[PDB]
């Protein structure tokens, strides 16, 4: 299925995923496209910061959903 990842500017990244994919797997697909390490990626859905050990279906993230991406600032 298709989901969208969207930064502070509204820049949108299209991803092909499955509901069984973990959040770490999503951040790995994001690294393949954007070149940002997954530890520096923070993904947000329904106002909550997502945990890497859980899956998309664990957060009820369905097709055509939008995740928001906020990178970590230096030091943090």
């Amino acid at each position: 299925m298709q989901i969208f990842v969207k930064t502070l500017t509204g820049k949108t990244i299209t991803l092909e995923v499955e509901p069984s994919d973990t959040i770490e797997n999503v951040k790995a697909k994001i690294q393949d496209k954007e070149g940002i390490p997954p530890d520096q990626q923070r993904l947000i859905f329904a106002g909550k910061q997502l945990e890497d050990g859980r899956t998309l279906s664990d957060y009820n993230i369905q097709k055509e959903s939008t995740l928001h991406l906020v990178l970590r600032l230096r030091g943090g």
Partner: protein, 39 residues
């Protein structure tokens, strides 16, 4: 060169989508507001 992290992580203030900033948790919002004031 270490300055490259925040060049990507913190886009210019005028380029922030208000609907995206609003979708973030409150702690993330405060962290970003504080970082923009230190620019």
């Amino acid at each position: 060169s270490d300055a490259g992290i925040n060049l990507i992580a913190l886009p210019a203030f005028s380029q922030v989508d208000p609907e995206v900033f609003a979708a973030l948790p409150a702690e993330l919002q405060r962290e970003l507001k504080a970082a923009y004031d230190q620019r």
